[PDB]
């Protein structure tokens, strides 16, 4: 009966692991052990955006790499001018419990959500001058984790109900619902072509979804704790993964197996956010040690420490231009490093 | 140097970063609270008494205090992964059912939940307002059924006052940081205003202590 199906699933998992082992021939360290180290990198803060009055939880850059939106628990999300440290907008929120924010690639819309189960959409290019709530996407029965825009008419959201859902802005109803996670989804990253996305949950697993039909292509396991952050490689063929095991892991879409783990005996705290650089040579991870560690993404060497925060670094993002990285922490401060 | 438009832009970004100051001042002055407890432990009755989908926010002005309130039990998810959002709350209103000590036992789950909540890293300095509910039915329930079933390691009279005092003393020692935080325990007074009055008194105590610590007078 169901025992036969369970045994079939077990043997399928065993043969999948055997196939993954067979394709495993040389780790990334062995391939890149001949490369020159990036060397000690010193990145000094250039701007400090102040004005938030509570522990911030979200930040997102614009496609022009000058405007970034950040959300905090004071019920406000602010779009900043990075060059001049100017607050262009301050949008009040119906619910102060915000855990994510998004900036539309066109720049016309922003999204925010949290414990209220609603990924609100705000209209910036309005003839009336003020920012209005375009649509409130409700009906997802769980705290939202990562709203991300596909276009001006679509959005991808992740909640604590173990389901990711692709929505439609103008109709207000979700086009596709992604199911398969057995733990609370907490992270989401979009591929550069917006054709695939990967999410991490409490199951210590990152699942590669497909926007077109919704089936889950590949499931990546190997973490020993929940996943708090996900980010693709710029090439789009790989993605990093931050967890509470104090280990960032780099995964491969094509090889479908873990590639390299980033660990140091000194750090024993979780990882709240990860990112990459334009070339993908180094990736920045925001720990709870009140500092951000820059890891050489090809040698697993700590290249430098971005220690400038007095509390846990909630999130960090790297511009599309690759010129600077902005980190946000629970002390209600945004630091643009360069 | 700045152009004609950049001066207007910084004036805009200075009025925006002027309204934020008043917004934060309003947010700090008001009082925030949490609701926690087991299922059907009396959250609905206290909420409806004090009033007169993930977060059931409640507002009620009493003695010139906004008294923002959050009922979080509506949404079921990893408690440990959003419990840090409520760090910095003024106090946690914890509802305990006195008469649920024998059904499946639930007093053991209530005390376990209280121990888990009071010993969180985030809820170190946040005082906990403790409510003991449905004492009226509790009186007759202990008149009929002995208390030793819930508490095997007990020896004492089976009267209402002594049993309630022992339950209060047992619950008040769960916390280990007795020096930093203080638990305010209360028995709900049926349909009187005394419950809201006690909540106001406890939050006033917490605010006074927090203000002293901010001034360094502590």
């Amino acid at each position, epitope marked *: 009966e169901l025992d036969q199906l369970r045994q079939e699933a077990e043997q399928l998992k065993n043969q999948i692991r055997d196939a993954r082992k067979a394709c495993a021939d040389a780790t990334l360290s062995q391939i890149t052990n001949n490369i020159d180290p990036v060397g000690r990198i010193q990145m000094r803060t250039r701007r400090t955006l102040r004005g938030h009055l509570a522990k911030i939880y979200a930040m997102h850059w614009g496609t022009d790499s000058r*405007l970034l939106v950040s959300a905090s628990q004071d019920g406000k999300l602010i779009i900043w001018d990075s060059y001049t440290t100017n607050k262009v907008h301050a949008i009040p929120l119906r619910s102060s419990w915000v855990m994510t924010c998004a900036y539309a690639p066109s720049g016309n819309y922003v999204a925010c959500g949290g414990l209220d189960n609603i990924c609100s959409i705000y209209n910036l290019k309005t*003839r*009336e001058g*003020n920012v209005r709530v375009s649509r409130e996407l409700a009906g997802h029965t769980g705290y939202l984790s990562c709203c991300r825009f596909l276009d001006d008419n679509q959005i991808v959201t992740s909640s604590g109900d173990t389901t990711c859902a692709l929505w439609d802005i103008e109709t207000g109803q979700q086009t596709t619902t992604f199911t398969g996670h057995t733990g609370d989804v907490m992270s989401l990253s979009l591929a550069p072509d917006t054709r695939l996305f990967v999410s991490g949950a409490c199951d210590a697993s990152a699942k590669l979804w497909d926007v077109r039909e919704g089936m889950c292509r590949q499931t990546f396991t190997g973490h020993e704790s929940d996943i708090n952050a996900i980010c693709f490689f710029p090439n789009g063929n790989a993605f990093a993964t931050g967890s509470d095991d104090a280990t960032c892991r780099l995964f491969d879409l094509r090889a479908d197996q873990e590639l390299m783990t980033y660990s140091h005996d000194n750090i024993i705290c979780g990882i709240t956010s990860v990112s990459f650089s334009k070339s993908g040579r180094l990736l920045l991870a925001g720990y709870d040690d009140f500092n951000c560690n820059v890891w050489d993404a090809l040698k697993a060497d700590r290249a430098g420490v971005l220690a400038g925060h007095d509390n846990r670094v909630s999130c960090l993002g790297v511009t599309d231009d690759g010129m600077a990285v902005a980190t946000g922490s629970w002390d209600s401060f945004l630091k643009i490093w360069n | 140097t700045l152009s*004609a*438009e950049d001066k207007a832009a910084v*004036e805009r970004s200075k009025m925006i970063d002027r309204n934020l100051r008043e917004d934060g001042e309003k947010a700090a002055r008001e009082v925030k609270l949490l609701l926690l407890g087991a299922g059907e432990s009396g959250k609905s009755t206290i909420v409806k008494q004090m009033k007169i989908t993930g977060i059931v926010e409640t507002h009620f002005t009493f003695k010139d205090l906004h008294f923002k309130m959050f009922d979080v039990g509506g949404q079921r998810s990893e408690r440990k992964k959003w419990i840090h959002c409520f760090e910095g709350v003024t106090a946690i209103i914890f509802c305990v059912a006195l008469s649920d000590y024998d059904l499946v036992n639930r007093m053991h789950e209530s005390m376990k939940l209280f121990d888990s909540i009071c010993n969180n890293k985030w809820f170190t300095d946040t005082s906990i307002i403790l409510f003991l509910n449905k004492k009226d039915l509790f009186e007759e329930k202990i008149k009929k059924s002995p208390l030793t079933i819930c508490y095997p390691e007990y020896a004492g009279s089976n009267t209402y006052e002594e049993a309630a005092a022992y339950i209060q003393c047992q619950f008040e020692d769960l916390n280990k940081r007795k020096d930093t935080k203080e638990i305010y325990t209360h028995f709900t007074c049926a349909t009187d205003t005394k419950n809201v009055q006690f909540v106001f008194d406890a939050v006033t105590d917490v605010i006074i202590k927090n203000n002293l610590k901010d001034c360094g007078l502590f």
Partner: single-chain antibody
Amino acid sequence: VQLVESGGGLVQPGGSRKLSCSASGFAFSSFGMHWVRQAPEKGLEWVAYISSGSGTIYYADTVKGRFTISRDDPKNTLFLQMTSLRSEDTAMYYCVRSIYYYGSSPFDFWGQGTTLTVSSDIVMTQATSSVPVTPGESVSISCRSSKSLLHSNGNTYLYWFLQRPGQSPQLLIYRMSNLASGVPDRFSGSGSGTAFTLTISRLEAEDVGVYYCMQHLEYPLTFGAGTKLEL
């Protein structure tokens, strides 16, 4: 949006008049108001500017001291108190809204205008004051400035306006490159410091009028003479 102004009419020289503008359909409290007159036969001319929150107020030198401007945020009304009106003060007083932030489009919407009848700086010159045109043609209007308008940050402060016959001006291109909202993509602006061009592709009806070029580099604000188009 709706900007309507009233209070114009005949007045004897040296008297006082109180122009008022009623603003509806937009967040008046956030927008900075302008007053722009236009002589019965001459071009447009900037008058005064009040910022959001009535913080910074600027006046043209020709009306400094004599004219004061105030705004009423909760009632959504803008005033322009005028004292000691002179003969040259007879003009078409337009009301213009302008929002100033990164990526905004100032001078986007214009009012109707009150009829008032009384019985150092960057100078703008437009090379040609009249260009005959025909349907389907493509003309390039040229406008020059005394000083190069390319600021250090990289924003070149130019504005192109279009005066329909017997109507209100409409913003076409702001900062020489960015098209205003609701404007067809036919128009195109380009150029460099002190040399500006406006390329119109496949111009059609409801497009003939007078085109003005504006500088926003520094106050006072000045316009070109006005290139007038006929069929």
